[PDB]
Curated annotation (Swiss-Prot):
Optimum pH is 4-6. Keywords: Disulfide bond, Glycoprotein, Hydrolase, Metal-binding, Secreted, Signal, Zinc. The gene is SMPDL3A. Glycans are attached at N37, N99, N190, N206, N231, N324, N405. The keyword Secreted applies. Detected in blood serum. Detected in macrophages (at protein level). It catalyses: 2',3'-cGAMP + H2O = 5'-pGpA(2'-5') + H(+); 5'-pGpA(2'-5') + H2O = 5'-GpA(2'-5') + phosphate; a ribonucleoside 5'-triphosphate + H2O = a ribonucleoside 5'-diphosphate + phosphate + H(+); ATP + H2O = ADP + phosphate + H(+). This is Cyclic GMP-AMP phosphodiesterase SMPDL3A. The lineage of its organism: Eukaryota, Metazoa, Chordata, Craniata, Vertebrata. It comes from the Eukaryota. The keyword Phosphoprotein does not apply. It holds the Pfam family Metallophos. Belongs to the acid sphingomyelinase family.
């Protein structure tokens, strides 16, 4: 039993659409909808539209009014909205990051925050470079009030840094720019090691290894396989394999990992080369509810809070908060509710890797009531009469339990493939 509980927030993929507004021509409500009629728009947004400022605002207002205390906050990026490149620019990107960064800093003057860059936090999107740049330097200025000179230094070099936490200074947050590894990123094609991030990672980890230090990885694009499709890593396979090895090697140091990018609530469990679970990974869903017209599903906006043991930074639990957008628009109020408490709904001990690996196995049971939950929660309770066939479920399961491609294919073939 632990004598006090550490808590920190994780917010991601804010995707602000400064255009949003209610008007009678639903093609004009928000530029992110790209000309489509916004399905049923309200003051807190629309499924076809990125986040109106007031949604983003209510999310942070709920945190401040939450009645939870927190040592820090993790912010995994993607702040500009989904509109085509010509419609945007480097300066707009920066104004948007600036607004977010300021808005947070105003409401949370005393709170430390550790950002990571996402793939839309650049113009043109996804083209995050190896060497310094206007955006990298822009954010370094904006995030000074939360970071070292040492941190800040590397931040401008290639979009990344690492940082002891003020209120727990043997906890080091490592913020990675995994956008360097994202498919669409033309800057990094054919590069052995973009911005020497692997070198610096291997280096930064090895260093924490010795100094009795625990590490939390923060980043935007997760490692592993995208769970709602077949044999597609989120990053470039090549890098995913490379990163997994690194995490394998130093898993004793890493006490948790945290990502966004997918806009969905997901867990993953890294196993050692031997096949034994050794690191827990957590992909938090987005604040924006945005989606394609052809897509049945999306997320409800979401916000989450983690719990740790201040001694070893072991992960005790996670509480997932959300907005029932439809309701929130019907009432025209920000009723940020609690969706679930992780150890409660799944009836497991903690967030250790063995704990979660065990839950994963329970999912594999024919008609697992457990997996059913996990799939409601996967789209942040968005439709709850939602269902899932054997194949989709297989693609989820394998993703949760297999991070590198050997073991992901074994899991796929095992049951069954073209
Ligand atoms: N509404 C949305 C928005 C993004 N996505 C997916 O999640 C990822 C989100 O990346 P961005 O947030 O950088 O667009 C994309 O790879 C996209 O395929 C989705 O499935 N539904
Ligand atoms: C998980 C949850 O809250 N789901 C609800 C449903 C309900 O029918 C709808 C109408 O308000 O709003 C939201
Ligand atoms: C941020 O953006 C929104 C709309 O674009 C505006 O109403 C809000 O006041 C701005 N706030 C800051 C701190 O820039
Ligand atoms: C949007 O809404 C109006 C009213 O339903 C409709 O007549 C019009 O065709 C729609 N336009 C598009 C692009 O969907
Ligand atoms: C999975 O994807 C990679 C493409 O990156 C491919 O080379 C590999 O052969 C594929 N595996 C299967 C089972 O098709
Ligand atoms: Zn995003
Ligand atoms: Zn993204």
């Amino acid at each position: 039993p632990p004598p006090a509980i550490g808590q920190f927030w994780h917010v991601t993929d804010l995707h602000l659409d400064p255009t949003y507004h209610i008007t009678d021509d639903h093609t004009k409500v928000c530029a992110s909808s790209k000309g489509a009629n916004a399905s049923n728009p309200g003051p807190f947004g629309d499924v076809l539209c990125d986040s109106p400022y007031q949604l983003i605002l209510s999310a942070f207002d709920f945190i401040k009014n939450s009645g939870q205390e927190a040592s820090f906050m993790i912010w995994t990026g993607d702040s500009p909205p989904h509109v085509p490149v010509p419609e945007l620019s480097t300066d707009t990107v920066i104004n948007v990051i600036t607004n977010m960064t300021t808005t947070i800093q105003s409401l949370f003057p005393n709170l430390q925050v550790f950002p990571a860059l996402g793939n839309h936090d650049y113009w043109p999107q996804d083209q995050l470079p190896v060497v310094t740049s206007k955006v990298y330097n822009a954010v370094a200025n904006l995030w000074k009030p939360w970071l070292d000179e040492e941190a800040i230094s590397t931040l401008r070099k290639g979009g990344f840094y690492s940082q002891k936490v003020t209120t727990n200074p043997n906890l080091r947050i490592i913020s990675l720019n995994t956008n360097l590894y994202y498919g669409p990123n033309i800057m990094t094609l054919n590069k052995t090691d973009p911005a020497n991030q692997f070198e610096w990672l291997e280096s930064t980890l090895n260093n924490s290894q010795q100094n009795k230090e625990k590490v939390y990885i923060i980043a935007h694009v997760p490692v592993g396989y995208l769970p709602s499709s077949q044999n597609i890593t989120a990053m470039r396979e090549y890098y995913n394999e490379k990163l997994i090895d690194i995490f394998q090697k130093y898993s004793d140091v890493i006490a948790g990992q945290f990502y966004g990018h997918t806009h969905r609530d997901s867990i993953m469990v890294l196993s050692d080369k031997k096949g034994s679970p050794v690191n827990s990974l957590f992909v938090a869903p987005a604040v924006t509810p945005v989606k394609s017209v052809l897509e049945k599903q999306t997320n409800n906006p979401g916000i989450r809070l983690f719990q740790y043991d201040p001694r070893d930074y072991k992960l005790l639990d996670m509480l997932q908060y959300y907005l029932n957008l439809t309701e929130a628009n019907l009432k025209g109020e920000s009723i940020w509710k609690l969706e679930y408490i992780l150890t409660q709904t799944y009836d497991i001990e903690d967030l250790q890797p063995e704990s979660l690996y065990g839950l994963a196995k329970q999912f594999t049971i024919l008609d697992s009531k457990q997996f059913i939950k996990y799939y409601n929660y996967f789209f942040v309770s968005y439709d709850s009469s939602v269902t899932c066939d054997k194949t989709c479920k297989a693609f989820q399961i394998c993703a949760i339990m297999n991070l590198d491609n050997i073991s992901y294919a074994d899991c796929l073939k095992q049951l069954y493939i073209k």
